[PDB]
Design a binder for this molecule. Structure first.
Ligand SMILES: O=C(O)[C@@H]1O[C@@H](O)[C@H](OS(=O)(=O)O)[C@@H](O)[C@@H]1O[C@H]1O[C@H](COS(=O)(=O)O)[C@@H](O[C@@H]2O[C@@H](C(=O)O)[C@@H](O[C@H]3O[C@H](COS(=O)(=O)O)[C@@H](O[C@@H]4O[C@@H](C(=O)O)[C@@H](O[C@H]5O[C@H](COS(=O)(=O)O)[C@@H](O)[C@H](O)[C@H]5NS(=O)(=O)O)[C@H](O)[C@H]4OS(=O)(=O)O)[C@H](O)[C@H]3NS(=O)(=O)O)[C@H](O)[C@H]2OS(=O)(=O)O)[C@H](O)[C@H]1NS(=O)(=O)O
Ligand SMILES: O=C(O)C1=C[C@H](O)[C@@H](OS(=O)(=O)O)[C@H](O[C@H]2[C@H](O)[C@@H](NS(=O)(=O)O)[C@@H](O[C@H]3[C@H](O)[C@@H](OS(=O)(=O)O)[C@H](O[C@H]4[C@H](O)[C@@H](NS(=O)(=O)O)[C@@H](O[C@H]5[C@H](O)[C@@H](OS(=O)(=O)O)[C@H](O)O[C@H]5C(=O)O)O[C@@H]4COS(=O)(=O)O)O[C@H]3C(=O)O)O[C@@H]2COS(=O)(=O)O)O1
Ligand SMILES: [Zn+2]
Lengths: 203, 196
C-alpha cells in the first residue's frame, strides 16, 4: 500500500529496531522457501533411489539450479537492506554532530554567556564526533573481520576520514575564541573534557 | 594461567553470552590497534608531505603493508572464534535432542506406558529436532546472504542433513505406532504438534 510506504516506520521504532525486524522477517520468509525446495528435492530423491547414475545427477542439477536462483535473491535482498541501513546510520551520525555543533555555537554567543551551558554543549559535540570516529574504526574492523579483501579497498579512505574528523574537532575547539573571557573561565574544565574524560580527538 | 584455561567459563554464563563478550573484547582490542597505526600513518604522512613522491609513495605502501598484516590477524581470529562457537552450538543441540530421545524411549517402554508422560517427552524431543532443523536452514540462509560460493558448496550437505533429521523423526514416531492404542490416542495431539 502506497500511503503506508509514504508514512514509513513509526517514530517510536528506531532505525536499529526497524532494521533488525526487517532482517528477521526476510530471514523467516527465506527459510520457508528454502525448506520447501529442500523437501521437494528429498521427495524426488526418495522415489529415484535406484535410478541410473546420470538420471540421479540430472535430478540433482535440477534442484541445485533452483537453489542457486534462491541464494542470489537472498543475497540481493541482504545487500539492499544493508545499504539502506548503512546510509541511514551515517546520516544520523552526521545530524547528531552538526546539531551539537549548533548547540555549542548558540551557547557561545549567548549574552550573558553561560559557562555551564557552553561546557555542556561542547561535551555533547565532542561525543558526537567521537561517535563518528568509533563508527569509522569499527566498520573498518568489521569488514576486515568478515571480508578481508573489501578491507584493503578501504584503508586509505578510512585513514583520510579519521584525519578529517580530527581536524574538524580542532577547528571547532578553536571557536572558543568567539568569547575569550568565557574561554579563560573554562580553561581547566576544557583540559578535563579532552584528557580526563578522554573526549579529545587525539585520545 | 593454564589452570584458568582448564576451567573455562563459569557455569552461569551461557555460551551465547560468553561468545558475544569475547567478540566485543576482541573488537575493542582491535579498534585500538588500528587507531594507533592510523595515527602513526597520519604523522609520517604529514612529516613527509614536502618530500619527493618517491619518498612519499614508499611511505604509504609501508603502512598499507602494516594494515594488511593487521587485517589478516583480525580475519583469522574471527574465524577461530566463529569455529569455536559453531562447534559448541552444534554439540548443545545434539545433546538436547539425544537427551530428549532417551526420555521418550524410557517413557515409551515403561510398564505400563502413560500417555501424559510419553506425550510430554515426545514434545520435548520434536522441539529439539526442530531446533536442529531451524539451525541448519538458518546457517545456510546466512552463508547465502553473505558468501555466494560457500553456499554453492554446502548446498548438497544441507539437503542431506535435513533428510537425516526427517528420517530420525519418522523413525521415532514409528516407535510410537508399535503401540496402536497409545498411538491413536496421542495422534490427535501429536498431529496438532507435528504440524505445529
Ligand atoms: O532449557 C530451557 O531453557 C527450558 O527447558 C525446559 O525447562 C522448558 O521446555 S519444556 O517446556 O520442558 O519443553 C522451558 O522452560 C525452557 O526451554 C524453552 O524456553 C527457553 C526460554 O525462552 S523463552 O523465554 O521461553 O522464549 C528457550 O531458551 C531461551 O531462548 C533461546 C532462543 O533462541 O529463543 C535462546 O536465546 C539465546 O540463545 C540463542 C542460541 O544460543 S547460541 O547458539 O547463540 O549460543 C541465540 O540464537 C543465536 O544467535 C542469534 C543472533 O545472534 O542473532 C541468531 O544468529 C544468527 O543471526 C545473527 C544475526 O543476528 S544479529 O543481527 O546479530 O542480532 C548472525 O550474526 C548469526 O551468525 C546467525 N547464526 S546462524 O546463521 O549460524 O544461524 C540465531 O538465532 C542463533 O545463532 S546460532 O548460534 O548460529 O544458532 C539467541 O539470539 C539468544 N537470544 S537472546 O535474547 O540474545 O538471549 C536461549 O537458549 C534461551 O535464552 S535465555 O535468556 O537463556 O532464557 C528454549 O529454547 C526453549 N526450549 S524449547 O521451546 O523446548 O525448544
Ligand atoms: O557486515 C554486514 O554487512 C552485516 C550485516 C548484518 O546486520 C549482520 O549480519 S548477520 O547478523 O550475520 O546476518 C552483521 O552486522 C554487523 C554490523 O554491520 C556491524 N556494524 S559496523 O558499522 O560495520 O561496525 C556491527 O554492528 C554493531 C555496531 O556497534 C552498530 O552498527 S551501526 O549501525 O553501524 O552503528 C550497532 O550498534 C547498535 C547497538 O547494538 C544497539 N544496542 S542495543 O542494546 O539496543 O541492542 C544500540 O545502542 C544504542 C543504545 O542506546 C545503547 O546501547 S546499550 O548497549 O547500552 O543498550 C547505548 O546508548 O549505545 C547506543 C549506540 O551504540 O548507538 O544501537 C546501536 C547503533 O544504532 S544503529 O544500529 O542505528 O546504528 O549494531 C552493533 C551490533 O552488534 O549489531 O556488527 C554487526 C554484527 O556483528 S558480527 O556478527 O560480528 O558481524 O553483518
Ligand atoms: Zn590538551
Amino acid at each position: 500500500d502506497g500511503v503506508d510506504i509514504y508514512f514509513g516506520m513509526p517514530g517510536e521504532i528506531s532505525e536499529h529496531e526497524g532494521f533488525l525486524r526487517a532482517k528477521m522477517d526476510l530471514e523467516e520468509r527465506r527459510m520457508r522457501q528454502i525448506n520447501e525446495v529442500m523437501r521437494e528435492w528429498a521427495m524426488a530423491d526418495n522415489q529415484s533411489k535406484n535410478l541410473p547414475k546420470a538420471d540421479r545427477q540430472a535430478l540433482n542439477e535440477h534442484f541445485q539450479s533452483i537453489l542457486q536462483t534462491l541464494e542470489e535473491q537472498v543475497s540481493g535482498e541482504r545487500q539492499r537492506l544493508v545499504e539502506t541501513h548503512a546510509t541511514r546510520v551515517i546520516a544520523l551520525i552526521n545530524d547528531q554532530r552538526r546539531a551539537a555543533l549548533e548547540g555549542f555555537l548558540a551557547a557561545l554567543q549567548a549574552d550573558p554567556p553561560q559557562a555551564e551551558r557552553v561546557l555542556l554543549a561542547l561535551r555533547r559535540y565532542l561525543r558526537a564526533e567521537q561517535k563518528e570516529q568509533r563508527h569509522t574504526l569499527r566498520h573498518y574492523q568489521h569488514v576486515a573481520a568478515v571480508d578481508p579483501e573489501k578491507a584493503q579497498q578501504m584503508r586509505f579512505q578510512v585513514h583520510t576520514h579519521l584525519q578529517v574528523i580530527e581536524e574538524r574537532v580542532n577547528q571547532s575547539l578553536g571557536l572558543l575564541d568567539q568569547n575569550p573571557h568565557l574561554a579563560q573561565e573554562l580553561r581547566p574544565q576544557i583540559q578535563e573534557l579532552l584528557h580526563s574524560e578522554h573526549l579529545g580527538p587525539s585520545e
